[PDB]
Design a protein around this motif. Structure first.
Motif, PDB file in Angstrom:
ATOM      1  N   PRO A 165      83.368  88.009  39.138  1.00 17.77           N
ATOM      2  CA  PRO A 165      82.331  88.969  39.574  1.00 17.77           C
ATOM      3  C   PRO A 165      82.755  90.431  39.494  1.00 17.77           C
ATOM      4  CG  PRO A 165      82.639  87.206  41.201  1.00 17.77           C
ATOM      5  CD  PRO A 165      83.753  87.079  40.215  1.00 17.77           C
ATOM      6  N   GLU A 166      84.000  90.768  39.841  1.00 18.01           N
ATOM      7  CA  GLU A 166      84.382  92.177  39.782  1.00 18.01           C
ATOM      8  C   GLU A 166      84.428  92.676  38.345  1.00 18.01           C
ATOM      9  OE1 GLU A 166      86.345  89.682  40.775  1.00 18.01           O
ATOM     10  OE2 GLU A 166      88.300  89.836  39.783  1.00 18.01           O
ATOM     11  N   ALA A 167      84.709  91.785  37.388  1.00 22.39           N
ATOM     12  CA  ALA A 167      84.742  92.192  35.987  1.00 22.39           C
ATOM     13  C   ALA A 167      83.337  92.402  35.446  1.00 22.39           C
ATOM     14  CB  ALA A 167      85.479  91.148  35.152  1.00 22.39           C
ATOM     15  N   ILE A 168      82.408  91.510  35.797  1.00 17.95           N
ATOM     16  CA  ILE A 168      81.007  91.733  35.443  1.00 17.95           C
ATOM     17  C   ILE A 168      80.487  93.015  36.088  1.00 17.95           C
ATOM     18  CG2 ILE A 168      78.690  90.805  35.550  1.00 17.95           C
ATOM     19  CD1 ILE A 168      79.972  87.992  35.609  1.00 17.95           C
ATOM     20  N   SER A 169      80.716  93.173  37.400  1.00 16.18           N
ATOM     21  CA  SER A 169      80.036  94.228  38.155  1.00 16.18           C
ATOM     22  C   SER A 169      80.579  95.617  37.829  1.00 16.18           C
ATOM     23  CB  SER A 169      80.143  93.984  39.664  1.00 16.18           C
ATOM     24  OG  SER A 169      79.447  92.810  40.078  1.00 16.18           O
ATOM     25  N   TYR A 170      81.906  95.777  37.747  1.00 15.05           N
ATOM     26  CA  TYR A 170      82.409  97.136  37.553  1.00 15.05           C
ATOM     27  C   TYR A 170      83.580  97.176  36.576  1.00 15.05           C
ATOM     28  CZ  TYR A 170      85.771  96.100  41.503  1.00 15.05           C
ATOM     29  OH  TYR A 170      86.753  95.591  42.331  1.00 15.05           O
ATOM     30  N   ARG A 171      83.640  96.191  35.682  1.00 18.30           N
ATOM     31  CA  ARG A 171      84.570  96.174  34.551  1.00 18.30           C
ATOM     32  C   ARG A 171      86.033  96.111  34.987  1.00 18.30           C
ATOM     33  NH1 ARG A 171      81.079  98.745  30.359  1.00 18.30           N
ATOM     34  NH2 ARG A 171      79.354  99.793  31.458  1.00 18.30           N
ATOM     35  N   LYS A 172      86.324  95.513  36.130  1.00 15.85           N
ATOM     36  CA  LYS A 172      87.714  95.374  36.569  1.00 15.85           C
ATOM     37  C   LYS A 172      88.292  94.076  36.030  1.00 15.85           C
ATOM     38  CE  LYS A 172      90.978  95.549  40.338  1.00 15.85           C
ATOM     39  NZ  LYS A 172      91.804  96.469  39.479  1.00 15.85           N
ATOM     40  N   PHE A 173      89.045  94.160  34.934  1.00 14.88           N
ATOM     41  CA  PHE A 173      89.704  92.992  34.355  1.00 14.88           C
ATOM     42  C   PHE A 173      91.178  93.013  34.738  1.00 14.88           C
ATOM     43  CE2 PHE A 173      85.929  93.330  31.719  1.00 14.88           C
ATOM     44  CZ  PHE A 173      85.594  92.035  31.435  1.00 14.88           C
ATOM     45  N   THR A 174      91.640  91.951  35.405  1.00  8.79           N
ATOM     46  CA  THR A 174      93.029  91.821  35.844  1.00  8.79           C
ATOM     47  C   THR A 174      93.464  90.377  35.631  1.00  8.79           C
ATOM     48  OG1 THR A 174      92.502  91.191  38.099  1.00  8.79           O
ATOM     49  CG2 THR A 174      92.681  93.581  37.669  1.00  8.79           C
ATOM     50  N   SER A 175      94.748  90.106  35.873  1.00  3.01           N
ATOM     51  CA  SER A 175      95.179  88.716  35.849  1.00  3.01           C
ATOM     52  C   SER A 175      94.442  87.886  36.885  1.00  3.01           C
ATOM     53  CB  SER A 175      96.691  88.632  36.049  1.00  3.01           C
ATOM     54  OG  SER A 175      97.333  89.214  34.929  1.00  3.01           O
ATOM     55  N   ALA A 176      93.931  88.507  37.949  1.00  3.41           N
ATOM     56  CA  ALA A 176      93.176  87.753  38.935  1.00  3.41           C
ATOM     57  C   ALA A 176      91.773  87.407  38.449  1.00  3.41           C
ATOM     58  CB  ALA A 176      93.111  88.536  40.245  1.00  3.41           C
ATOM     59  N   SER A 177      91.172  88.233  37.584  1.00  3.44           N
ATOM     60  CA  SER A 177      89.927  87.789  36.976  1.00  3.44           C
ATOM     61  C   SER A 177      90.198  86.703  35.942  1.00  3.44           C
ATOM     62  CB  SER A 177      89.126  88.978  36.402  1.00  3.44           C
ATOM     63  OG  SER A 177      89.797  89.743  35.416  1.00  3.44           O
ATOM     64  N   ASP A 178      91.376  86.730  35.303  1.00  2.00           N
ATOM     65  CA  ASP A 178      91.773  85.617  34.444  1.00  2.00           C
ATOM     66  C   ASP A 178      91.914  84.328  35.246  1.00  2.00           C
ATOM     67  OD1 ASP A 178      91.820  87.081  32.018  1.00  2.00           O
ATOM     68  OD2 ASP A 178      93.996  87.350  32.060  1.00  2.00           O
TER      69      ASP A 178
END
Ligand SMILES: CSc1cccc(Nc2ncc3cc(-c4c(Cl)cccc4Cl)c(=O)n(C)c3n2)c1
Length: 275
Positions: A165-178
């Motif tokens: 959700p954070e990557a969809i919502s505000y483009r935050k891509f991290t190892s945790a979105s992985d």
């Protein structure tokens, strides 16, 4: 690029198309010990500067990695045209298609072992400070030892159903979105390649996730495995397991394989009542 081997075009023979499209193809071929099978990605003449940077940048990234569960780079052809990236050849292809074509043919322990390999590759990537952003069974490749290897690297590459959700919502891509994506991959593996959220639209998926809904338990899924994918899908990023945690848990389940026999309840979508 100085880390990559420059391969002469005469050592490479393309044999069969196996992927891609507009600006190049992917072939199965042979690399000239004796000749070994390889995959060969090409970049056709007319490519732009950005295309060249992204294409050789994938090779440059892959050349920095050395891990059992990460696709290995053999070398590049950059001096001659067309340019090529040459990698090990994975005999069974993409994991999502492989599972769909082999429905029900593996043991639960084999499926969990595939997930351990993917998680070990991802732990390596995350500790190497590489965020994948597109982790999905379609980007995992499988060899004839059933070893699963992460592929598709660079920043040339959102796939909503796999994305945190954070990557969809505000483009935050991290190892945790992985890690969120890895949870979806767990579900893909244990369902033999079911499509996440079935026919829900992208907007319906985002809405369902924001309202707290999660993918339901696959059939015949170990309780421990469903609990683990559920914790990958925590809304709050900080509450998700790290890949180190995931590898550890899967290791312990595989080493005590009776732990996998306790299944989570499956919610049947159909009832058959017989007298
Ligand atoms: C389901 S498609 C399929 C079908 C049959 C066999 C294989 N085996 C296989 N094996 C290896 C690769 C490697 C690459 C590759 C290359 Cl060549 C360069 C840079 C990045 C990647 Cl991921 C690749 O694109 N593909 C498709 C590969 N495919 C795949």
């Amino acid at each position: 690029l100085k880390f990559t081997t420059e391969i002469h075009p005469s050592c490479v023979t393309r044999q069969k198309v196996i992927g891609a499209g507009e600006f190049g193809e992917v072939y199965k071929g042979m690399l000239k010990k004796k000749e070994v099978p390889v995959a060969i990605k090409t970049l056709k003449a007319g490519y732009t500067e950005k295309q060249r940077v992204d294409f050789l940048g994938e090779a440059g990234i892959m050349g920095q990695f050395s891990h059992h569960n990460i696709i290995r780079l053999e070398g590049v052809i950059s001096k001659y045209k067309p340019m090529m990236i040459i990698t090990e050849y994975m005999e069974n292809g993409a994991l999502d298609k492989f599972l769909r074509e082999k429905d029900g043919e593996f043991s639960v322990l084999q499926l969990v072992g595939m997930l351990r390999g993917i998680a070990a590759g991802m732990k390596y990537l995350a500790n190497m400070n590489y965020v994948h952003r597109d982790l999905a069974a379609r980007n995992i490749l499988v060899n004839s030892n059933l070893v699963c290897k992460v592929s598709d690297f660079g920043l040339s590459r959102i796939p909503i159903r796999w994305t945190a959700p954070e990557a969809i919502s505000y483009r935050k891509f991290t190892s945790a979105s992985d890690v969120w994506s890895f949870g979806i991959v767990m579900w893909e593996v244990m369902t033999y390649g079911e499509r996440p959220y079935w026919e829900l639209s992208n907007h319906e998926v985002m809405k369902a996730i924001n309202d707290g809904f999660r993918l339901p338990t696959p059939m015949d899924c170990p309780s421990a495995i469903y609990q683990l994918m559920m914790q990958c899908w925590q809304q709050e990023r900080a509450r998700r397991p790290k890949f180190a945690d995931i590898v550890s848990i899967l290791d312990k389940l595989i080493r005590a394989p009776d732990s996998l026999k306790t299944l989570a309840d499956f919610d049947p979508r159909v009832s058959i009542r017989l007298p």
